[PDB]
Amino acid sequence: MTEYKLVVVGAVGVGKSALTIQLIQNHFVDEYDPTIEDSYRKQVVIDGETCLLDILDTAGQEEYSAMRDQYMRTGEGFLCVFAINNTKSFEDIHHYREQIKRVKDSEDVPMVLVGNKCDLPSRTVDTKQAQDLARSYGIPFIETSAKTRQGVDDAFYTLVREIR
Amino acid sequence: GRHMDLGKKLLEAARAGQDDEVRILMANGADVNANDSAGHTPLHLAAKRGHLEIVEVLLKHGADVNAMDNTGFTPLHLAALRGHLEIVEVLLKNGADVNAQDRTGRTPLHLAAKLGHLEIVEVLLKNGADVNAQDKFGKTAF
Ligand SMILES: Nc1nc2c(ncn2[C@@H]2O[C@H](COP(=O)(O)OP(=O)(O)OP(O)(O)=S)[C@@H](O)[C@H]2O)c(=O)[nH]1
Ligand SMILES: [Mg+2]
């Protein structure tokens, strides 16, 4: 089958790990364990085709920012996650995007913008603002909740389609 | 049934650093090399977290000192990444492969040098780490 190398990036505490464990194990982890760098493997069916997702879940913590180069070289697609009650994390998508482009020497890298934690009542980052950001970058925008599982498959599967 | 479930609790106890809960789970037959979905063993989680006692205990109980998770990290990669010196030492005295490569070709030295852990770099070189080792992009530790 075709293997897709997916990389999940974003700021501390946005739900990168909770999204990923939802995809792999279908369960929601309420507990913060800070990620260094973890790999997960899932054989799935997308658009009627069997394929393998090789998923790297990365560190939000800036102390590991020197490891970014390496996973930016190896990844085929990037799930760019922010949390909808975390302005800084939305703004940080810019820094992630810029580094990706510089490492791949390209403006067209498969990428999906993920607005996580859409189950939450109040929010500080507008849906419109995110839709605009994704239209600027020419990439899809998906609203997710790792807690409810909303949009979880959609987000990863959409990144796969972008790699194709 | 039970045996699998002891593994998951051993993983948790090793991560959460409960030194004595580890001792019990082992004596109820738990698997010392139980894997989480990311491929970590208890020794990876204990090395990552910096729990020296738990690292010693797991090694006394036949833990695979060069086990690799799904990213290709050994426990020595994890201890080095975050500067846990005495852990790096103990792992090495128990036969850790000093030049083990992750899936991208990085040794422990690559990671220690990348994150500026100078005391780990020195101890790694004293234990036969290769200064000219290249990862899969041709890049040395520096
Ligand atoms: N309400 C809600 N909480 C969430 C959601 N996703 C994650 N969380 C919670 O946020 C906290 C941090 O999530 P986590 O997945 O660990 O962040 P991270 O992005 O991996 O952080 P890091 O490893 O780079 S340091 C956890 O308590 C988790 O339960 C969500 O969709 N909704
Ligand atoms: Mg995480």
Numbering used by the authors:
A (entry chain A): 1 to 164
B (entry chain B): 19 to 160
Give the original sentences from the paper that presented this experimental model:
Wild-type Ras GTPases cycle between an active, guanosine 5′-triphosphate (GTP)-bound state and an inactive, guanosine 5′-diphosphate (GDP)-bound state1234. The P-loop (residues G10-S17) is responsible for phosphate binding, whereas the Switch I (D30-D38) and Switch II regions (G60-E76) are critical for interactions with guanosine nucleotide exchange factors and effector proteins. To increase understanding of the effects of non-covalent inhibition of nucleotide exchange on multiple isoforms and mutant forms of Ras, we have isolated a pan-reactive antibody mimetic, Designed Ankyrin Repeat Protein (DARPin) K27, which potently inhibits nucleotide exchange, and also a comparator, DARPin K55, which inhibits the Ras/Raf interaction.
